[PDB]
Every structure is written in C-alpha cells, then in structure tokens.
Design a protein around this nucleic acid. Structure first.
Lengths: 249, 249, 249, 249, 249, 249, 249
RNA sequence: AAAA
RNA sequence: AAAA
RNA sequence: AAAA
RNA sequence: AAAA
RNA sequence: AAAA
RNA sequence: AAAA
C-alpha cells in the first residue's frame, strides 16, 4: 500500500523514522506534489498521513494541501489518518481562523486520529501501523533480521485478519515486492541485498506462491511449515544453501 | 527420476511412445553406453527399463548390460524393472544357454515384472508408469492440456503416496524442472513453450513454492486452491491475463 | 536525456559543479542559444534547469529566456525544474514587477521546485538528480571508480522504477553512449578513456546488450550476475584482461 | 569446438554435407596434416571424426592417422567419434589383420560410435551433431534463415544442458564468433553477410553480451525476450532498421 | 473452360501432375503473362489457380500477380480457387506484413479454398477437379481407355449438374474439342491420335451431335445408348470397324 | 574551412595571434578585398569574423564591409561570427548613427556573439574556436608537437560530433591538407617540414585513408589504434623510422 | 610473400599459369639461380614450389636443386610445398635409387603436399594458393575487375587469419605494393595501369592506410566501408570522379 | 488431313 | 442417353 | 502454513 | 541481473 | 580508431 | 619534390 506523508520541515527529524518503520513493514511511501499523485493506480491508492502539529497548522501551504486531500477523500478516493505529534489538549486552535478551526474539528471528531509521543517510540510506532492495516486486507510485520542455526535470514511475516480472503484478492492487491528488494548492499530497501528471506504466517498456497515467485535470481527463499515448525529452503542462490535444508526456527 | 532404456532395434517402435509417455510424466529419459551413466548423481539414480522380447535375448550385445546393470543392481545403486514385450508363456527360454536361462529365471521370479501388449496401450502404459512410481515420492501424472473458461492451459498433476513427506525430502530430490520447459514452440518438451501451467493436487506449501518458483520469466503460473476449487493465477507472463483471475471448474 | 542550463554568471561557481555531477550521471548537458536548441530530437527533449536566485531575477535577459521556456512548456515539449539557489523565504519578490511576480509565483506553486544549500552538498545534488529522474524512464547513478581484486573499474549503475519497461523503449530513448566516452586521458567525459567499464543493476537482456555493444574497440566491459553476485568480463581490449574472469564484489 | 575430419576420398561426397551442416552449427571444421593440428589451443581441442567405411580401413595411410589419434586420445586431449558410413553388420572385419581387427573392435565397444545412412539425412546429421554436443557446454542449433513481420534475419539459437554454467566459463571457451561472419555475399560462412542476426534461447546476461559485442560494425543484432516472446533490435547497421523495434514472434 | 496455374518453381513438380490431370478432363490450360490473358474470350473467362505455399508467399512477384488476380476478380471477370500445398495451420502468416496478412486472410475466409496433401493423391486431385466444376455446366470426367470386346476404345464421360441445361447454352460454351485431339501418336493430348472415342452419359440430342461432329476425318466415334446399354458406332475411320457394331458391356 | 578576418589596424596585434591559433587548427585564414572573395568555392564557404571594437566601429571602410558581408549573409552564402574585442556594455553606440546602431543591434541580438578578453587568452581562443566549429562537421584541434619514446611527432587530432557523418561527406568537404604542409623549415604552416605526423581520434577507415594519402613524399605518417592505444608507423620517409614501429603514447 | 618455381621444361605450360594465378594474388614470383636467391630479405623468405612430376624426378639437375632446398628447409630459412603434377599413386618411385626414393618418401610423408590435376583447374589453383597462405598472415585474393554503377574498378580483397594481427606486424611484412603496379597498359601486372583500385575486407586503420598510401600519383583509390556497404573514393587521379563519390553495391 |  |  |  |  |  |  502506498502512503503520502504531509508534514512541515520542523518535524522532519521524526517523519522518516516513522516512515522507515513503515518502510520496513513493506509499505510504499512517497514524500516528494502529492495532490496529483493521489489519482494514480487503483482506488486503493494510499492512506493520507496528516502529521498534525502546532507549526503545521501555522503554514498556509501545508493547510491547503489538507483541504484538497480531505475534499477528495469525501469521494472515497483516499482515506486520511491524522497523527498528533502533540496531544489533543495543546493544539493552537485559537490562532487559526473560524473556517480552519471548524474544518480541523470536523475531521478530528468524525474521523479517528492517532496520538504520537516521542517518549514511547515502541507503542507509538505500533499505533500508526495498526491504524494503517485496520481497514486493509492481510497485513505485514516489520521484517526481522534473525539468525537460525548459524544462518542469516530476514523473516517476512504476514497476518491474515479473519483467516479468509476473496478468491480474486490478488487482482486488486497493489503490492509489487520487486520494488522492496535492494539492488546493492548500500542501497536502502526493506529487503537486504543477497540476504536470504523467509516467509512466515498461515495462508493459502496461492499467497505463498505469489510472494515467492518474484524472488527468483534475487534472493535465497525460505518458507515456514507448521507441521514441523521448521524453515524449508526452496531456492538456492547463495552458496551452501541446498534446496531442502531445514532450520529449527 | 532418470530412466535408461534397454531395447533392440526391431522393437524400437514400441520404445519411443513408451518413452514419450514417460517424458510427459516429468521423467528424464536417456535412450541413446548406459552402464557408466548409472553411476551419476544421487543414490536415487534411475530405473533400468529392460524391454524383454523374444529377439532381445538373442543378441549377445544385448545380454551383457542386463548382467552389469543387474550386477550393480545388487549394490542398490539402481533398480531394474523388466518390460515384457511378449507374454512370459512363450518366451523362448530354450534358446538361451543354461547359465543365461537360470540368470533370466532368477531375475524374473525374485523381481517383479510388468506385462506389456500392443493391443491395449492405455493399460500397458499405465502399468509401466505404475512400475516406475511405486517406490517413489510424490507422483507425477502426464501433463494434460485443457481449455477452462476459454483459456488454454496445461496441468501438472502430482499426487503424494501415503500422506506425509520427509521434511528434508527436497534436499535429495532429482526433479529439477528447468529441463522440461520448451524454449521454442516447434521443439518438443513435457511443458509447452509460453503456455500457462497450472499446479493441481494436495500438498505442502513448500512443495508448491518449489515448483512454481523456477517458472519465473518462462511461463504464466496457475495454482489450485481446494477451499473453493478453482485455479488461481500468480504470475502474468502473457498478455490478456493478470495475477488474481480465477478459472472456474 | 539532455539538459539545458540557464543561469547568471554570479552563480557560475555552483552551476558547473552541479553540471559535472549531472554529467557523471550520464546526462547530456548543454551550457553554452537555448531557445532554438529546445526544438530538437524527440518529445522527451530536456528538463529546463532554472537556477532561481536573487541575482538571477534582476537580469531582464535572463527573464525573457524563462518566459519563452515556460511558454513552450505549456505545449509539453519541455518541462522546467526550477532550482532555488536561496530558500523561498528570502527570495526578493518585492523588487520584481506585478506581472513578473505573478508569473514567478504561478510556476512556483503549481510546478514542483527543488531547494539548494551550499552547506549540504550531498543532499542538494541528490535532490536535483532525483527531480531529473522522477518523470523519466530507467535512471542512471553517478559513475563510481572502484577497485575490485586489484583491478581498476568503473561502474555504470542504472535503476528501473517499477521493474517494467515498454517493449519498444529503446526506440524513443535519446541516449547515445558513444558521446560520453573520452577519446583522451585528459578529456573530461563520464567514461574514462581506456578504463574498464562495468554494468550494474537488474534489467532485461536487450537493455544489457544495447548498453555494452557500442563499447567495442573502446573499453573492456564487465557485467554483474546476481546468481553469484560478482562481475564477469565479456570484452578484452586491455592487456592482461582475458574475457571470462570473475571479480568478486 | 574444433573438428578434424578423417575420411577417404571415395566417401568425400558425404563428408562435405556433414561438414557444411556442422559448420552451420558454429563448429570450426578443418578438412585439409591433422595430427600436428591436434596440438593447438586449449585442452578442449577438438573431436576426431573418423568416417569409418569398408573402403576407409583398406588404406594404410588412413589407418596410422587413426592409430596416432587414438594413441593420444588415451591422454584425453582429444576424443574420437567414429562415424560408420556403413552399418556395423557388414563391416569387412575379415580383411584386416589380427592387430587391426583387435584395435578396431576395441574402439568400437568401449567408445560410443554413431551410425550414418545415406537415406535418412535429417536423422543422420542430427545424430552426428548430437554426439558432438553431448559432452559439450551450451549447444548451437544450425543457423535458421527466417522471415518475421516482413523483415529477413538469421537466428542463432543455443541450448544450455542443465540450467547453470560455471562462472568462469567464458575463460576456457573457444567460440570466437568473428571467424564465422562472411565478409562478402558469395563467401560461404555460418553467418550471412550484412544479414540481420538474432539470438535465441534462455541464458545469463553476460552470455548475451559476449555474443552481440563482436557484431558491431558487422550486422544488426536482435535478441529474444521471453517476457513478450518478441525480438528486440539493439544494433542498427542498415537503413530501415532502428534500435528498439519489435517483431511479433 | 480455361485455367491458369499460378505457382512458384519450387512446387513445379506438383503443379504439372495437377496440370495433366486437369488436361485429361477436357480443360484448357495455360501454364506459361496471365493478367492480360485474363481478358480474353467470354464472361466465363477462366478459373485462377493460386498454388499457395509457405515458399509461394515469400515471392513479391507471386504476391503482386495474386493481387491483380483478386483485383479484377472483384469485377466478376474471373473467380479464383486457392489450392493450399500445406495445411492452413502450417501457413507461415507471421512472415507477411500487416497488409499482406490481412489480404491473405480476407481471401482465405470469404472465398472457399481447397486443401492438398501429396500423400493422398487421388482424393486431393478430385477436390481440385470438384472445385473446378462446382460452378460450371455439364462436367467432364478424365478420359479413360477401356478395351471392350477386344477393341481398344477411349470414353469421354460427361455428366450434367442438376437435370437440365439452357437451350442456348451452346452459344456461350468454351469447350471447342478440336484443340484436344492429338495429331501424332507421340504428341500428347487428352484425346489419343486415331484411337476410337466414345461418348457416354445422359444428355440432349444436340449435345451429342455437337460433340460428335468435329470428330469427322479424325477418329472413329462411338455413342452409348441407355436403352440396352452398349456402344453404337456412328463413324468408321479405322479398318475392321463399321458404323453399327455393338460392344456389349 | 576558409575564413576572412575583418579588423582595424589597432587590433592587428591580437588578430594575428588569433589567426595563428586558427591556422594551427587546420583553418584556412585569409587576412589580406574580402567581399568578392566570398563568392568562391562551395556553399559552405567560411564563417565571417567581425573583430568588433570601439575603434572598429569608427571606420567607414570597416562599416561598409560589414554591411555587404551581412547583406549577402542573408542569402546564406556565409555566416558571420562577431567577436567582441571589448565587452558589450562598453561598446560606444551613442556616437554611432541611428541606422547603423539598429543594424549593429540587430546582428548582436539575433546572432550569437563571442566575448574576447586578453587576460583569459586560453578561454578566449577556445571560445572563438568553439563557435568556429560549432556549426561544422568533424572538427580539428591545434597541432601538438609531442615527443614520445624519444620520437618527435606533430599529432593531428580530430573529433567527430555525434560519431556519424554522411557517407558522401568528402564530396563537399573543402579541406585540402596539401596547402597546410610547410615546404621549408622557416615556412609558417600548421604542419612542420619533414617532421612526422600522427593521426588521432576515432573515425571511419576512409577518413583515415583520405588524410594520410596526400602525405606521400612529404612527411612520415603515424596513426593511432585503440586496440592497444599505440601509434603505428605506416610511411617511412625519414631515416630510422621503419614502417611498423610502435610508440607507446 | 615471395615464391620460387622449381619445375621441368615439359611442365612449363602448367607452371606459368600457376604463376599467373599466384601473381594475381599479390605474390611476388621469381621463376628464372634460385638457391642463392633463397638467402635474401627476411626470415619469412619464400615458399619453394617443387612441381614434382614423373619427368621432373628423372633429371639430376632438378634433383640436386631440391636437395639443397630441403637442406636449408631444415634450417627454417625457407619452407617447401610440393606440387604433384601426377597423383602419388602412379608416381614412378622405382626409377629413383634407394637414397633418392627414401629422400623423396621422407619429404612426401612428414611434409604436406598439394595434388594438382589438369582437369579441375579451379580447385587445383585454389589448393595451391591455399597452401601458400595457410601459414601466412593476412591473405590476398586474386585481383578481380568488377564494374559498379557504370564505373570500372579493380578490387584488392584481403582477409586476416583468425581475428587479430601483431601490433608490429607491418615491420616484418614483405609486401611492398609499388612493384605490382603496371606502368604501361600493355605491361602485365597484378594492378592494371590507371584503373581505379578498391580495397575491400575488414581490418585495422593502419592496414588500410599502409595499403592506400603508396597509390598516390598512381591510381584512384576506393575504400569499402561496412557501415553502409559501398565503396568510398578518397583519391581522385582520373577525370570524371572526385573524392567522396559512392558506388552502391 | 475426304473441299479444314 | 428413343427428340434430356 | 499438508491444496487456508 | 539465468531470456526483466 | 579491428571495415566508424 | 619517387611520374605533382
């Protein structure tokens, strides 16, 4: 899923660290316009993250972007998830005009907001991620660089809410995993270059095949079988990883 | 699994379509010595196909490989199954010498043979394949090309004997699939060039992932889900189809 | 893709160091008219680099060049990328006339701008290059001169956004790699004279063949194979470089 | 791979059309001594084609050439493939002395020979080529002069036994292609003069680059991409052809 | 009826054997322009025979000649019957351009074609003959030589489609018979020189008189009467025969 | 390419050194009328150099020469390259008459000019040469007297913009190398008398053969091969310079 | 390369026509002592042509000449290639003494000979030429006079063995061209007087320059470029043509 | 080809 | 096919 | 997660 | 990046 | 720049 | 300037 970030340069320190966590969760992100990038792809285009702040409300350039984003959001094209860097009590709603104050209160009440505090990074990163996948189909977890039996792996774990998906789910799923694979060790991507990957979590066989297939000539692939709770090697690109090796995970 | 064919030139006509049927079942066939390539690969080398015939045993060139193949069959390196072109009743065991007759009788009784007759090709071909797959892992029925919902498609049907597989089975398997995909339409191969291929049959997630993965950049891949019983598209290498469409049965 | 540079002589110090970085990215640069050079080649003509600055906006000759460039930009022949030498806040908008101020603000709001700061060289150059390639097909990284296994090399890294290209992409691609090869050691060009050139980045076979073909009798060519992740020599022009060694990277 | 032809003048008519077909398979042929030409090049020197016939073994001069060829074949530097112009049944074994008969019988059994019959040209020529390529790296089908979408070109299709090649394969290879390109229309060579050349078959990126590179300033180059199963033009050395046009295969 | 044969020299062997069979059916044939020879005779001009083949469509001379044949075929001057040397599926339609392929497909569907197979000569030749006579008046089976009661004789078998013919049909007929009578024994013609001819088949009185009359001073004439089913001699040019003898069937 | 120099006698000091530098670049220079000499040779006559200066505009003889030169420049016979001795801001257009000032301003604006500064001579000379070659085919660099391995050479280096020339380029190229060879050591010519020359830069073989050919019995000719990046001797007129010696340059 | 002809007067008719063919192939031939002419020039001296015949070996003067030729052939100064006017089968070995017979058999076996026949001149001349060039550098096909586009012209076709030549190859070459240019129309020489000469065949730049240069003031020179495949005129010594005209193939 |  |  |  |  |  |  794509994600457009609206923010001021003052909170630039914290947006990417939030964005990086989202990036590690196989979520497409776009920073730099955004209004015309909304009308692109499928109706499941992106979820707007309005990083509300005292400074952000003081910028007219940043304000009108929220107006156009919300105006077309009523059409159902996009959904907005506003993030409060400061708690609900201390927004400067007095400084803003009556039209702006009414506009902010309408979207703050009828639409759910996510509170953010820099002190507790762990829960805050979970809350934004939870709201991101709350209205979406099968979710993903941030990839974990773990070592099992002396072998380095990056496990890709996904969770299916309700344990049921539409049979034609892949038709409307805009998740192309090739864009998340690093082409070089120094390149920043969710999936490390040449590092073997592992698939985790319950799911139908067609979902596993769909994720496994684009990894040919890119990464060694492991899969998880709950019959023996062990990892199974199905692709051999790295040296020494024969197809069929078992890792007691 | 590899297969080496022992036969005479007179019975050649019977060999090829037997080999052709075996090739369609994803069985590697080597028709044209034979002894030295038996010592190659893994302990699961091949099955010696001795096309026993009334004339086959009348050639001194044809007798020895049966001896050497049997000689190393005692070592367990290979297993031999005899193809009886004619019935056991009218085999001319009188023609052979005493040593040859007893040797032929020793291998015919202690080792199971399979009867073959030109008249009923469908049963005879099935018995030969059964004699091939009886002591093997997950089976492989011949590739059948079917048009479902107006979409042409070929099915790779696999069935597991028993109910479970060793967790490390893929390590010792010798069914690398790259050698069964045609590169040009005119060239013959078990898998047609550019024709979408569907995987059908119950099995573990890793076995499906192992099969579909080498098909990237080669063929459109379909997969069967038993929850609703249609075919699911995972790879789109052909125009007019996308990953996620369904072919109702 | 070629690039046209419209700037004032005071910003000459920053323009060339910007220009050379673009040149190292396999981008054709034309510094020194420009209005008539716009109408040349393919519809993907060039990106107008308007280095807006406080000194830039007080030159009437510089203003009329921008006016015609934007006038044709409405026709879609050439798009403009305005790069700000100074940040928008300190731009001297009061000095200019009403029509010019409205004109400058019109292109500053509807069309995306990129900011430049002398302090942050690395991020400033990357932002300008990113603005160049965002609307472009397969992009190019700046050429890096590295030594692998004691052998001098230069790597031409290219990344394809979306991992998909039109079948007839080479038809409309205005990149002639011959013009970027130095004919003498002292000549300044993206590709060093007689230095081996390595090709890096995933891509189709035709893209690889098209890129390394013009290098015959000019440079020895290396290519990257991700199956074992190390460069392969395919052309031999220098002494001691047989075609076929592997350089572990 | 080099090829030396040992034959008698009576069987000459058969040799040329065998040599011509082998030449079309990008095989270096040397008809007219031979023993000293064996000591040349790499350990993969050549294959000795002994065109055995009833007339051939009556010549003392032809016999010593076979003697020295087999004597140094024991070192493994060259391997011999004996082509039987006549079937083994009516080979005049009584004519030769005891030493010659024992020698000829020794090399016919332990070494694989091929049968040649004047009636079945298509099967005989393929079998001889099959023995040539059976112990070899990537194959080379004879150049096919085809016409697609109104344009005429010669295709060069190659098959890779197995699926993978050694990383340093090109170092030991001896298939310098520039010797197979005709310089004049009347010149008879595997590659026609100025005729477009197409490469077909799945393989690594470096293999394709190594093949198209010597074709600069010689012929236009086409490559086959399996994503859309179409030929792609990379080089345009002739009018009416542009680099990047696509032919529907 | 006249007929022109359009073919290339590669298929010349099959055209002549088709040619002579049509000649025995009393069909005027012209092998070797053809376009201006179309405008000759009566509105029932002739039938065009386009010997389509994979090699036939690769000649521009054949194509342009075919186009003019179809161009004035629309005017109704001539009707074309395309005889396929190879089966329709094996037609190399990819080689032709868009215009040529569309033109060939237009005439293959809207206009009935005839399929030829060299394996089944007798049925293939009849289909060409059947396509020839399907839109024609009274038919003409090939001349057969039958020795009846020890007397050699040739039969000109004719049958009338339907049951009746126009009263003035003879006015527009193009089957003058003096051009099919051999003048010397060595010279080849549908009617043998000096051999008695016989007319067989139901028909009107004038049809028998019209055919019999040109045979005066040329050959002995026999007429078949269905009242008692023998042959009646009406003209005696050979010794030993008189007008009035009967040949019992 | 030819050229006439229009200047006042006060600028004679700087004109000759500019003329000498252009002469070193294989440019035919004519200093001392100029109007009637314009109509001579081919359509690519020359580029007119107007050495504009404050004193130059004060001469009626110089002014009327410029008028006729520009008047016939409109027909396209020759194009004018205006070289400004002083900067544009310092030109004295006030004392100049109205009609001439409009004439001067029309030329300066619609046609590109080159600035001249005696301080930065290296950039000044190159800028004039750049505009001199800017609208021309393959350009020529100033001759460099280089000693390589103790051997004196005068390298003639040429650059081809776009690496492609019309096949009949030599037909309309007005460059005769004979006139640039010094007949005596004291003669002032671009090519030194009896000093060996070298050809540098990529180009077609016929271009090389065209250049070295008129040097027979005049100078020893060296050529540069990029296969080993070494100079090759092809002519031996000087003592001790055999044809074939290699100079590692 | 130089050539010496050792022959008997009875075979003079066949010898001078062999010399004529060799002369046409740019081979300098001296027919009429020879032993002292062996020691002249470079180590690549000349190839001895011993026209062996039944009459030739019956002359003591011819026999002693061959012995000295073979005496210094062991020293490597000159290599001998023998022409068999008659076949080896019916050579009269019984005439020679034991020493002569053994000596002749010594050179017939360890040294490759060329069989010549009166009937098939075309192959016989080619075989003699092939032996001359087999151990040589860049070949030289016989000069052919071909008219292109109404212009008379002669072609000097040369081909390089393998693909590359030593960088200093020109130093040791003994193929000065001025000795093969006719000075008068009646005089016989490989290169006709005043007829334009064309150079054809792939090769390095210096090779073309070395061949082209000595033709100044002698003949018009055409150069073949493979980019577009025509001949390019570089020197104009004949009226009616200029440097730059093209001769379309 | 016996008025073609 | 005995005025088809 | 052994056709979810 | 082993026909993307 | 080894038929640009 | 070695048939300019």
């Amino acid at each position: 899923p794509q994600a457009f970030f609206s923010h001021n340069n003052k909170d630039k320190k914290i947006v990417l660290e939030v964005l990086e966590h989202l990036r590690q969760s196989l979520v497409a992100t776009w920073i730099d316009s955004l209004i015309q990038q909304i009308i692109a792809g499928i109706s499941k285009s992106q979820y707007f993250l309005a990083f509300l702040s005292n400074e952000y409300l003081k910028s007219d350039w940043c304000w009108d972007e929220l107006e156009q984003a919300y105006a077309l959001h009523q059409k159902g094209k996009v959904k907005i998830i506003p993030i409060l860097l400061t708690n609900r009590a201390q927004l400067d709603l007095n400084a803003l005009t009556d039209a702006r104050r009414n506009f902010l209160e309408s979207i703050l009440t009828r639409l759910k907001y996510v509170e953010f505090d820099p002190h507790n990074m762990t829960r805050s990163l979970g809350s934004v991620a939870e709201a991101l996948w709350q209205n979406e189909a099968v979710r993903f977890e941030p990839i974990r660089m773990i070592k099992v039996n002396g072998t380095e792996l990056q496990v890709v774990e996904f969770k299916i809410p309700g344990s049921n998906l539409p049979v034609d789910f892949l038709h409307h799923w805009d998740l192309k995993i090739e864009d998340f694979i690093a082409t070089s060790p120094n390149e920043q991507k969710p999936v490390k270059f040449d590092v073997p990957v592992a698939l985790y979590g319950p799911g139908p066989n067609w979902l596993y095949a769909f994720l496994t297939l684009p990894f040919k000539n890119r990464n060694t692939v492991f899969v998880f079988n709950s019959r023996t709770s062990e990892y199974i090697c199905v692709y051999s690109k790295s040296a020494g990883l024969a197809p069929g090796m078992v890792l007691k995970g």
